[PDB]
Scaffold this active site. Structure first.
Site, PDB file in Angstrom:
ATOM      1  N   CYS A  33       1.008  -1.030   0.219  1.00 27.92           N
ATOM      2  CA  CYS A  33      -0.182   0.144   0.057  1.00 27.92           C
ATOM      3  C   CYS A  33       0.690   1.391   0.145  1.00 27.92           C
ATOM      4  O   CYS A  33       2.123   1.258   0.732  1.00 27.92           O
ATOM      5  CB  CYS A  33      -1.319  -0.350   0.965  1.00 27.92           C
ATOM      6  SG  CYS A  33      -2.844  -0.293   1.060  1.00 27.92           S
ATOM      7  N   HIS A 140      -0.628  -7.902  -6.926  1.00 28.75           N
ATOM      8  CA  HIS A 140       0.767  -7.585  -7.088  1.00 28.75           C
ATOM      9  C   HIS A 140       0.990  -9.103  -8.378  1.00 28.75           C
ATOM     10  O   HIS A 140       0.769 -10.108  -8.326  1.00 28.75           O
ATOM     11  CB  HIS A 140       1.600  -7.582  -6.551  1.00 28.75           C
ATOM     12  CG  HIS A 140       0.856  -8.819  -5.277  1.00 28.75           C
ATOM     13  ND1 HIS A 140      -0.003  -9.451  -4.822  1.00 28.75           N
ATOM     14  CD2 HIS A 140       2.270  -9.356  -4.868  1.00 28.75           C
ATOM     15  CE1 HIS A 140       0.344 -10.555  -4.530  1.00 28.75           C
ATOM     16  NE2 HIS A 140       2.004 -10.709  -4.239  1.00 28.75           N
TER      17      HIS A 140
HETATM   18 ZN   LIG Z   1      -1.989  -3.106   0.266  1.00 31.36          ZN
END
Ligand SMILES: [Zn+2]
Ligand SMILES: [Fe+3]
Ligand SMILES: [Fe+3]
Ligand SMILES: [Zn+2]
Ligand SMILES: [Zn+2]
Ligand SMILES: [Zn+2]
Lengths: 314, 309
Positions: A33, A140
């Site tokens: 994040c 990701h």
């Molecule tokens: Zn995250």
């Protein structure tokens, strides 16, 4: 820490010890994040070092043993953070232009690695789904920049070279142009189909219509049509089962940094639900003997995939 | 149904298109196919991936396809439904399991068709074993499994270069990673281990085919399997799902360059969470470890001491 080698299979094992977190140790703040000193802010895409790298810039001296080949664990392990948002389920959920930036950022990481001139291989892949061990939920992908060629790619490389010598052309182009019945999706620059030789319950390979052997050779319209290919295919797999499907995606391309006329780059997507939505585990057949089984024809599976892919358009 | 061939990797794909009471076990005694008064059985698999009279293979223009010709069998390891693992069974029972598998291989050897006899076992709900009743699988096959093919080449090539069996040489030198040995077998974590709890079990005498084993070697195999599998059951705290496969030569002529062994892939990491083969493993045949084979060998070996009995 070192890259060991299996003297019977030639497969490499990235041995890189790290202490494993206890069950009482928190998972802790999402490492991907934005807004932490590690991650920075104002970005769309973040490529950063894996916290527990399997290959490193100055790796310890390799553990040695008389009968075995050991190579220093040298290179880079990176995470491609695909978006600053945490609660998106999948790459396919992202907007087309967001997908484009991820691709472009990966392409650019490869350029750096190419130029630098050491790394034998740039390996891009993505794991998706709690059910296949993805505990980090933030979307990701991963890059390994490698001192060796992945054994699977190395095998594809040999069989590709040997057909080019025999017939004069690339087998991949020949395979891509001929395939249409098992077609799932295509656009100006990419074809996505269930291969004849499919091994996993929902498999799709994504090839560029023009012969590219390397990510870095992609035209900006190729990269853009790729984003669309990936999005819609991934969307089709996310919907076919009735529940979002866990999947594995890998980029198969030539080694660094010189192109090839016999090998042609492609994304393989192994979707890991059977038609009824129960998970398919790689077991003794697969891991033990490299034998695969399918309870359903690839032709029938392209249908279901293509039919579900219709819903994705919008 | 047919066996398709991947043109880039050499791998085989067994393509085969496919109401009962809840709480019915198809391997339990008293079943339609089982009967009673038995200790071990080898049954036809209900949904076989190969069969004796396969249909015409579906041909395609740029690919090799071969008929799906072979036998798919289940090895019901015991009449008891409620046994967790092969390693809870007594030595005598494990001896009959081994002997049964060996007799079926001999039969396949004599019949003279099958290229390969592949014995394997999957264990644990977490890796897809929904039939809890202790069982093993045999595939009698018209081709050599690609992983076994690869191991053959590389062992053949070493033999030619150095004039001896690489496996026989590897087994002599195993001490640090040793987990167990007895009169006829050694069990060790190999230097090249790629799963979180990997143990290979090799005969001390050079052997290439299960059917060459003496009665004493079979008995000692029974023990080695029990104690080793007992070790992996205990090593992480709870029962560990695992894969076991027998790597042996093709049917039916023995090889001087290849040396039979069982590979066991225990699929919990040290922390007790399941490892899944993913993009690196399936997509690239690259494997990673978070713990040294040496430290894992020590952990298994320490757990195994509790199992000596
Ligand atoms: Zn995250
Ligand atoms: Fe490929
Ligand atoms: Fe082996
Ligand atoms: Zn091509
Ligand atoms: Zn039962
Ligand atoms: Zn030997």
């Amino acid at each position: 820490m070192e890259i060991r080698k299996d003297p019977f299979t030639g497969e490499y094992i990235l041995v890189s010890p790290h202490r494993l977190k206890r069950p009482w140790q928190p998972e802790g703040a999402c490492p991907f994040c934005p807004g932490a000193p590690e991650t920075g802010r104002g970005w769309d895409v973040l490529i950063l070092p894996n916290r527990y790298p399997v290959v490193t810039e100055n790796p310890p001296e390799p553990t040695a043993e008389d009968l075995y080949e050991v190579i220093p664990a040298r290179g880079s392990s990176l995470v491609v953070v695909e978006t600053p948002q945490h609660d998106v389920d999948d790459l396919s959920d992202l907007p087309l232009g967001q997908i484009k930036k991820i691709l472009t950022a990966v392409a650019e990481a490869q350029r750096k690695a190419e130029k630098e001139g050491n790394a034998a291989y740039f390996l891009f892949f993505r794991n998706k789904g709690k059910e296949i061990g993805v505990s980090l939920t933030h979307p990701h992908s991963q890059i390994y920049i490698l001192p060796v060629v992945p054994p699977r790619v190395r095998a594809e490389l040999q069989a590709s070279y040997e057909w080019y010598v025999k017939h004069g052309s690339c087998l991949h182009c020949r395979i891509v142009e001929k395939e249409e019945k098992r077609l799932v999706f295509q656009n100006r620059n990419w074809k996505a189909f269930v291969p004849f030789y499919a091994k996993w319950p929902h498999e799709v390979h994504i090839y560029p219509k023009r012969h590219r052997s390397l990510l870095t050779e992609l035209t900006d319209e190729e990269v853009a049509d790729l984003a669309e290919a990936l999005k819609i295919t991934l969307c089709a797999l996310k919907q076919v089962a009735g529940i979002p499907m866990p999947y594995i995606m890998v980029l198969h391309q030539a080694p660094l940094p010189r192109p090839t006329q016999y090998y042609h780059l492609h994304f393989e997507i192994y979707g890991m639900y059977r038609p009824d939505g129960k998970l398919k585990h790689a077991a003794g057949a697969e891991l033990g003997a490299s034998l695969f089984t399918l309870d359903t024809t690839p032709e029938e599976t392209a249908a279901r995939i293509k039919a579900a892919l219709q819903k994705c358009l919008k």
